Amino acid sequence: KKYIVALDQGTTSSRAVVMDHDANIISVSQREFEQIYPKPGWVEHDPMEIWATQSSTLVEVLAKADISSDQIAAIGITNQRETTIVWEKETGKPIYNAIVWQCRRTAEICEHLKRDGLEDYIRSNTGLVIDPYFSGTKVKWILDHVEGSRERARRGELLFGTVDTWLIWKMTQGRVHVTDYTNASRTMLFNIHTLDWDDKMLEVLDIPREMLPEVRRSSEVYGQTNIGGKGGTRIPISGIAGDQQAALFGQLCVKEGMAKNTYGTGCFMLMNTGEKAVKSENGLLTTIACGPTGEVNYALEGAVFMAGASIQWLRDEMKLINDAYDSEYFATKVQNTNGVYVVPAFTGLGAPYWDPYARGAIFGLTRGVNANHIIRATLESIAYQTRDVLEAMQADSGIRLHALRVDGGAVANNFLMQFQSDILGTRVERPEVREVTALGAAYLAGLAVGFWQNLDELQEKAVIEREFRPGIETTERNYRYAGWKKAVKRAMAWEEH
Amino acid sequence: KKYIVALDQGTTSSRAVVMDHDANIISVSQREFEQIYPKPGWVEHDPMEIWATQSSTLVEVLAKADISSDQIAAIGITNQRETTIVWEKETGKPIYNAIVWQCRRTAEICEHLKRDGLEDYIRSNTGLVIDPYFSGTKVKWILDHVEGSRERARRGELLFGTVDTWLIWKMTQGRVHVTDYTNASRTMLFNIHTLDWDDKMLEVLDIPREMLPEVRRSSEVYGQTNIGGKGGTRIPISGIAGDQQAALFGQLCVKEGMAKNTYGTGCFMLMNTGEKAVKSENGLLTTIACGPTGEVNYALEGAVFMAGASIQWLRDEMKLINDAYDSEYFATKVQNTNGVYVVPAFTGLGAPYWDPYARGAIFGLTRGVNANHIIRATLESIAYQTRDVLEAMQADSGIRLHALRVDGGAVANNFLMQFQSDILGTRVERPEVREVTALGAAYLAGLAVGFWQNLDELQEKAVIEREFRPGIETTERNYRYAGWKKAVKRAMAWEEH
């Protein structure tokens, strides 16, 4: 039993990683799944596709590396954080598509909450802001949408779950229905204090206690999978965290004050707040993180819905680039957006604007503006956003980040990185590997099964490939922000209710 | 002497046309020139390039068709309407680049005017709105900008001119410095009532009477060119109108109530207002047009800076299409902008917004929005804009257009056309040839020299290739406008003063 295996269920792709005692990545496997947009502002996913893509990779990784089930010390699970799922207990057949995190359909409802005045309750018990972002709404919506539901849900013939959940469920064959705290913290049906399903909540959204799973800790054994190979040979499942949290962990930010920014589908900057929860005064999120070994901790989170995803759209949608010619490629061909600004409200906004009507937009178009400027402009949106939240965190946190700890594909983008640094007017530290996410789950489940005893051992696995120090001055720096901001406003409240 | 030749000096290209008594286009020639953008919101042109491209084509056309100077009954001149030029009398060497019409540099000044309260004077004597659009400002700017200027301009060692002017000047070798009324009407230094250089004006912008040319009528002989060929064989020059007006003419809109919309670099919808001038209550322009034979008339004009130019940018800038694959091609591949809106404030706005800070922008971006939607979205911007002005004209004019008379390349775009119709909720009539512009000058100069006696003869040259009748209903129609509008606002006052 020499390997930990991590299931990394992205927003965009299912991943699988093999890592050794040395916490090395032995092998990886990636499967993309369809981004479903039933309609503008909507985003779905096929549970099956998820499942399928994730199971398959899981196999592939082993496959490829001659590794046999029986060397799999255990399995860690990390996932895309809010997308909701509902399916028939008996069958396990979804009553409906996955309603992913970015999907803005709830919105309305959110207004009702708004209107009924739970701002506070919610915020004060969930740490959450009112948004279409979170599971609660989703669930409901489903229920509502799908006829018999509630009633059947009442007889819990119907089940609820986030991705970690669903996965597991499937890996165990119904055997186990569970989530972990990190995940649970985002449903907006779960008290992050009490640490239980929030009655009032369920009450409100009117969700059967019956469909929710057992919340558990991020590292622990929740069960096991049979994936053939040697007969009656099973694999323990013992790690579970929100991709975002999974990262902070892999990042070894197990101590309050430690923060990171993940450059993925969205930007996700989290700060450990130790064992203490932190109210956000700057429309930030307050949630559940991992203790130095997956215990309960807290964090401050800055959620930016549109980040690599951005990049991905210039590619697959705008078709303005390829896997051949990088965003960086071009971006660097010009020396500026030419005044251009991109506002990736592709999904509405969020931290800290938390608009759900704000929509994607370009500004400051000139006769001579080209792709490149566009490209770049895009690329910069990221840094921008980041800044926002960043700044915000300080506020809330009360801590100046002196350098930035980053992770996620995007971070490979030297340009971006630089800019980020400039723009921040802060060094930015780019590590050896961006899999921190997977690491985390690795770590986690690994820990949970002794594979490792503690982050200690691997305090030194962490390598700073590069650091970027600002090269722009306040003035300037403070200037561009200006437009960015200018722009930003222009995008909001776009969509019609 | 069997042919009239038209010099069509576009915003984007220099053209040349040969037409026979039958008013047929015998041959054409086109040369593109560089679009100069010294900086965002700026647009220049090289006088020489202009000149060069125009002279050369002029030759080419003849060349190509075995036509000899001596069959050229005469020459008509039509041009891009506001761009300003200033050059050394002696040398004819510009003291500075052409400051084309769209260039927003004046702006400021315009504010001063604003501030000093001439809204009215200006409007009431020039028919003009206060804008960076018009020559006045430009001139000044130059002067100011260029050291000795004023003083040298005072000794008129320095000359002023719009394109028709400059051309001529050159064709005659200094011999003649003249403009026509249409052109003059746009300087915003010229009384469209009095029909003279407006003292107050010059006063204001502080422009030496000394540099302005003699204003004359659109059809008349102002002189002649030597372009080799048979010895001492000259060609009379006898037609002069603003491309826009040149079109209305070619359009045979010599009678009040007659209007058209030109689908060119910009959209330009004009309405004949006969011998009577018309105040605009909906921020429209009041200007000089042609009488049934180039006499003075008036019109109502709707100026839309960004039209084909738009299309041209997706091509050369965005590179999102080609001469191979049409905007139409794609546009039609989707069924809607997907909610997207393009605001071609690439040059600020104008009729009727007359913003000069409004800048290019895209809105309503979604994860699934693609090129196409973009493309289209672009394409539709046109129709939109049009609508605006259209509606506005009625207001002012007090006349419902029952079908739309159109011209300019774009009009070939069935899509666009349809949309236009739908959107308008009005039939749109697309003629046989879009050269109406050139026609006009043809006509003009031809008339001026008897070649023809009057539009009468060619009342029947005009062929309706196609008509587009709406297929969208109010509701809908009135809906999309809504966003378009929504959008539109979001673009304004973008640029920083």
Curated annotation (Swiss-Prot), chains A, B:
Enzyme class, spelled out: transferase
The protein's annotated pathway: Polyol metabolism; glycerol degradation via glycerol kinase pathway; sn-glycerol 3-phosphate from glycerol: step 1/1
Residues where sn-glycerol 3-phosphate binds: 11, 81-82, 133, 243
Amino acids binding ADP: 11, 15, 265, 308, 409, 413
Positions bearing N6-malonyllysine: 230
Regulation: Activity of this regulatory enzyme is affected by several metabolites. The non-competitive allosteric inhibition by fructose 1,6-bisphosphate (FBP) causes alterations in the quaternary structure of the enzyme. FBP inhibition requires that the enzyme exists only in a tetrameric state. Salt such as KCl reduces the affinity of the tetrameric form of the enzyme for FBP. Unphosphorylated phosphocarrier protein EIIA-Glc (III-Glc), an integral component of the bacterial phosphotransferase (PTS) system, also inhibits non-competitively and allosterically the activity.
InterPro entries in the record: ATPase_NBD, Carb_kinase_FGGY, Carb_kinase_FGGY_CS, FGGY_C, FGGY_N, Glycerol_kin
Biological process (GO), any one: glycerol-3-phosphate metabolic process
Reported function: Key enzyme in the regulation of glycerol uptake and metabolism. Catalyzes the phosphorylation of glycerol to yield sn-glycerol 3-phosphate. It also catalyzes the phosphorylation of dihydroxyacetone, L-glyceraldehyde and D-glyceraldehyde. It uses only ATP.
Self-association and partners: Homotetramer and homodimer (in equilibrium). Heterodimer with EIIA-Glc (crr). Binds 1 zinc ion per glycerol kinase EIIA-Glc dimer. The zinc ion is important for dimerization.
Protein name: Glycerol kinase
